[PDB]
Design a protein around this ligand. Structure first.
Ligand SMILES: CNC(=O)C[C@H](NC(=O)[C@@H]1CCC[C@H]1NC(=O)c1n[nH]c2c1CCCC2)c1ccccc1OC
Length: 128
């Protein structure tokens, strides 16, 4: 029987290989062993996003946020998901929140969050 962390790493490896259903199933098996780890839900939300399953991706972001309200990644993926759903105002607020949390936690993602914010703001404007 593999451990929860072994399953998270197998899921990450599968994600790098673009095997999204397989990766989501590994994160699900990690959750079965330990359902109190926010990053398992955040990682699976990204799989759901790659599989275009937006309602499932939102639900995993919410499960991650309930365990870790300070999650930079859960707010970032929530915002990206909302952007694809055309919920622009909500997307921008979550991306801005990921930016502020990353700055407070002294995390370095280069121009990842400002770039995502610019895409969302341009998409919101183009629709207006
Ligand atoms: C944004 N893309 C991912 O989070 C994919 C994820 N990458 C990581 O965990 C990177 C390894 C070390 C550094 C880390 N970077 C980030 O966390 C990251 N970068 N820009 C941002 C963030 C977080 C949110 C704001 C923008 C990943 C990689 C391999 C396999 C699976 C897997 O995730 C399921």
């Amino acid at each position: 029987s593999p451990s929860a962390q072994e399953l998270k790493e197998q899921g990450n490896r599968l994600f790098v290989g673009r095997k999204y259903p397989e990766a989501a199933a590994c994160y699900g098996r990690a959750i079965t062993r330990n359902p109190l780890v926010a990053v398992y839900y955040t990682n699976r939300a990204l799989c759901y996003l790659k599989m275009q399953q937006h309602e499932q991706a939102l639900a995993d972001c919410r499960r991650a946020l309930e365990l870790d309200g300070q999650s930079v990644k859960a707010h970032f993926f929530l915002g990206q998901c909302q952007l694809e759903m055309e919920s622009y105002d909500e997307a921008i607020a979550n991306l801005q929140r990921a930016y502020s949390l990353a700055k407070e936690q002294r995390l370095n993602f280069g121009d990842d969050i400002p770039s995502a914010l610019r895409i969302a703001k341009k998409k919101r404007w183009n629709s207006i």
